[PDB]
Amino acid sequence: KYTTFQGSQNFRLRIVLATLSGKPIKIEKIRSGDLNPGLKDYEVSFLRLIESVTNGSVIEISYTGTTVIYRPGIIVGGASTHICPSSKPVGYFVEPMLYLAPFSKKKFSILFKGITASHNDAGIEAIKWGLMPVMEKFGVRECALHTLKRGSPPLGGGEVHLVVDSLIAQPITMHEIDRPIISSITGVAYSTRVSPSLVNRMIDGAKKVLKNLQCEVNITADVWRGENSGKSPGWGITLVAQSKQKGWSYFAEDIGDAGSIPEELGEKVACQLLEEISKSAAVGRNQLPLAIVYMVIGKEDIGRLRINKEQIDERFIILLRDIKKIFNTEVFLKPVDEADNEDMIATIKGIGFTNTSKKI
C-alpha cells in the first residue's frame, strides 16, 4: 500500500528517498496540534519543484493539509525556473535537488530565485565548496552552482543557477577508512549592499582564531555592490578546511544580523570550524546525510565510511531509520582498530541502484 511516516520531520529527505526508491509513501499528521496545521508554504513549494523535475508523479494533499500521498515517477530533469518563497532561501531547495540531479533523463538546469542566505539552511558557499565536492568524490564529475545575484534577507532578490552536466548510472563505492589530513583552510567572506570593510573585519576575526594553526589560511573577500547585490544589506562568512590529498572538506558558515559585529561573527565561525573538525572523521555532520544516501544507492558492494563518535547523534539515528523504512538497508558500524580515537567504520551495502531514466 504505502509506507507511512509521521509529522513534518525530515520532509525533504522522505520525499527524496521515495523518489530514488520509487516506492510510494504517505506522510500524515503534519503539525496536527499547531494553530496553523498542515503543510507550510515552502513545503508546498518543494512539492511543486519535485513535480517539475519528475514525470508521472502523483502528489495528493489532504483537504486539511495534514496528509501527503506521494507516488513517485521517473526523474526527468530539464530546464526550469523556481521562485522560492521568502520563508526559505534557495539553499533549502537546491540541497534536495543534489540527491536527484545525477540520475536524470535530461540535465538539471534549474534557476532559483529569492533569498540566498539564512541562519538554518545551506548557503551558496556551503553548497559550492562543502556539499558539491562530496558529490565529486562519488562520481559526479561536472556539477556547478552559478551565482547570478546575491539576495540577503529579508527582501532577497537573489538568483542561483544549478547545472549538473554529469548524468551517472550510480555513485561509486566509497572506501574512506582513515582520518584525512587538513592541508589548508580557505573560505569566502561576503557582503551585499554594504561597505567592503565589513568583509575585511570578518576576515580579521577569522584569521585571529586560526593563525595558531600550522597551515595556510586564505579567505576570499566577496564584496557584492550595485545591481546584482540584491535588495537588502547583509554579510556572512564560510570557512572551509580542505584535504587536497583525497579531496575531502569540512566547512562552517554563518551570516550577520542587524546590530552584530563582523569580528565576532568571524571568530564564531572560526571557532565552529575547529569544533566541526574535532567532531569529524572523514565528513562533517552537515555532509554526513548526503554521503550515507549516496552509499546506499551504489552497486551491490560494501562501501566503508569512517565516522567519529561525536557524529552519532539524534540526527544520525533518525536518518538511518528513515533509510531502513524506505530501502530496508541497515548500516553496520564496526570499531576502528586504533586506540588514538574511538571512531567507527560505517559499512553500507549498496542496493544496486541504476539510472534507468537515461536513454541508451
Binding site: 513535480e51 514525470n55 508523479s57 502528489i59 495528493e60 494533499i61 483537504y63 493539509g65 515517477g73
Partner: peptide
C-alpha cells in the same frame, strides 16, 4: 506533462 500535484486544501 503527466501526473501532478492535486491540492485539495481549503
Amino acid at each position: 506533462k503527466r501526473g501532478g500535484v492535486i491540492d485539495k486544501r481549503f
